[PDB]
């Protein structure tokens, strides 16, 4: 057919939109369990029952995790078996035989959800979509158990059914090149910042001050998040894989702990700064030398370092699951296992303490703020909107993730994965978010002016 | 937006006493360090003395035990009393306004600049 375009119109990718691909054993909207792609175990509510008719089905001890090729085996073997289903069956041959391959698609896709049986019940519905009525059908569909048990993929595929084209499940496609675009849109912002602001301090000498070496070291962190976390994960989400091997997958893991703890406890570095720097200038000037605040940023790589690459090369950050066991023995995996005690150390160690110092400092400033030697002026609302879009960024972007990070491993996840990253890269842009507010100094101002030559 | 008033410079005998004094016109952020600084002739321009809102001070090592800085208690002046003055103390002398309102950074206001002769 000459048809090597992205989506192809077939029952494949409909039901892989549909229901989705899970690799452990879950229960569906009714209760029963269900792995792989809308793969119906048993009816049984005993976890035990349905670990059996896995087994037996796959042809191993799985322990209620299969992979993606069983899984995918599953899939197709399930899909014939309802389009066997519906040759079969009396009630639906006939309507099968009068429907386009869409609409075709559409009834294997009812036969793979409810059974042969189930949707050979239908008599109303089969019945004129053998006249093909389709708008009539469509009418008649949306008002069965079917569509009020789930109520989205059933407009789906009764649209599916009326207009007779792929509308439905269409506008998907469109959303993956959409985020696409949106990740490159984020690679280049952050890598240009953080290049802009290390090259700004580096040349220029009257940006030679110790809260400007706090912000090198920020804009460093943020520069290697831009540089390989962040393209490596994107290409890790929108080819579905990971094409690199676990060596690199660990590694890949290994420089997002690092790059994201060194930039949050860097922060709070920058905070502290401050403080000391507002709040008692002249011991501030006469203490904190610039080998000082050298070592200060060698304790905070070290602290990050034996958060992130120690552990996770030593694999002691592994978690013990069976999933977690064959994401580790798969060469294409990468997804992010931990086991109670990393998720909460480093949740600790990379955002909390760095969260509690900063609120703490900040709160200290807005208070020793109103007991100087002093009308109600506009200045102090200007500082306080400008500490509000100081904290209010960075608690906006990372707070969702380390929250969801400490509540995804206290109990099995009820909390899907694509919330997960998604609040995970929602804590990525920060990287990008922290060069326009910790470079808008005068001095940063027409260094980054001369340096593009505007 | 803000104005700095200096005032009490001028001619003075080696080992006499001057008063500088300098007013801050408008809006300035609670946390600020407001000080003096100095050009010589064939000099940079050199930090003479500055107070922090929080009442403590800061002097250079040529001036400390001779200049004594203080501020006024509600309307943000500075006075720098300089005694036993010495014929390399003749610079031009600015006041200055450290601003704390942006946190990460500083925001300076500069005077428009006394001049101050000490005859040798």
């Known amino acids: 057919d000459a048809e090597n375009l992205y989506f192809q119109g077939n029952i494949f990718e409909m039901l892989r939109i549909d229901e989705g691909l899970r690799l452990k054993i879950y229960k569906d909207t009714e209760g029963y369990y269900t792995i792989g792609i809308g793969h119906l175990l048993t009816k049984s509510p005993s976890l035990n029952a349905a670990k059996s008719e896995l087994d037996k089905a796959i042809g191993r001890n799985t322990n209620g995790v299969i992979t993606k090729d069983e899984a995918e085996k599953l899939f197709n073997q399930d899909v014939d078996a309802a389009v066997r289903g519906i040759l079969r069956n009396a009630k639906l041959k006939p309507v099968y035989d009068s429907l386009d391959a869409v609409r075709r698609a559409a009834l294997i896709n009812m036969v793979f959800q409810m059974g042969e049986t189930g949707v050979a019940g239908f008599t109303n519905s089969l019945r004129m979509l053998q006249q093909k009525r389709w708008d009539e059908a469509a009418v008649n569909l949306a008002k069965s158990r079917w569509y009020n048990q789930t109520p989205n993929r059933a407009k789906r595929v009764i649209t599916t059914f009326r207009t007779g084209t792929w509308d439905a499940y269409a506008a998907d496609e469109v959303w993956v090149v959409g985020m696409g675009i949106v990740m490159s849109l984020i690679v280049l912002a952050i890598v240009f910042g953080n290049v802009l602001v290390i090259t700004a301090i580096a040349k220029f000498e009257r940006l030679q001050t110790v809260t400007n070496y706090f912000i090198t070291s920020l804009a460093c962190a943020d520069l290697v998040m831009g540089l390989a976390v962040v393209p490596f994960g994107a290409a890790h989400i929108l080819t579905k894989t990971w094409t690199f091997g676990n060596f690199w997958c660990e590694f890949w893991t290994s420089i997002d702990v690092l790059c994201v703890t060194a930039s949050i406890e860097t922060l709070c570095v920058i905070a502290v700064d401050r403080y000391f720097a507002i709040t008692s200038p002249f011991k501030y000037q006469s203490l904190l030398t610039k080998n000082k605040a050298r070592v200060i940023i060698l304790m905070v790589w070290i602290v990050s370092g034996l958060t992130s690459f120690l552990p996770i090369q030593m694999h002691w950050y592994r978690a013990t699951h069976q999933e977690a066991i064959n994401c580790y023995a798969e060469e294409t995996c990468c997804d992010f296992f931990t086991n109670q005690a990393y998720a909460i150390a480093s949740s600790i160690v990379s955002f909390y303490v760095p969260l509690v110092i900063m609120v703490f400092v900040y709160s200290r400033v807005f208070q020793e703020a109103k007991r100087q030697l002093q009308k109600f002026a506009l200045k102090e609302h200007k500082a306080l909107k400008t500490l509000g879009i100081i904290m209010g960024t960075f608690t906006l972007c990372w707070l969702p993730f380390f929250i969801v990070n400490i509540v995804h491993v206290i109990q099995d996840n009820l909390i899907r994965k694509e919330v997960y990253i998604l609040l995970n890269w929602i804590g990525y842009v920060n990287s990008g978010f922290n060069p326009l507010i910790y470079c808008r100094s005068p001095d940063f101002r027409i260094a980054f002016q001369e340096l593009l030559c505007l | 937006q803000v104005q700095l008033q200096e005032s009490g410079g001028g001619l003075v005998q080696a080992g006499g006493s001057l008063r500088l004094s300098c007013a801050a016109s408008?809006?300035?952020?609670?946390?600020?360090?407001m000080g003096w600084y100095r050009q010589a002739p064939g000099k940079q321009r050199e930090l003479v003395a500055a107070?922090?809102?929080?009442?403590?001070?800061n002097y250079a090592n040529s001036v400390k035990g001779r200049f004594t800085i203080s501020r006024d208690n509600a309307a943000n002046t500075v006075y720098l009393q300089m005694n036993s003055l010495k014929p390399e103390d003749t610079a031009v002398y600015y006041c200055?306004?450290?601003?704390?309102?942006?946190?990460?950074?500083?925001?300076?206001?500069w005077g428009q600049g006394t001049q101050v002769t000490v005859s040798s």
């Open positions: 200055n306004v450290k601003d704390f309102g942006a946190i990460i950074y500083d925001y300076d206001y």
């Open positions: 408008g809006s300035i952020f609670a946390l600020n360090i």
């Open positions: 107070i922090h809102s929080g009442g403590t001070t």
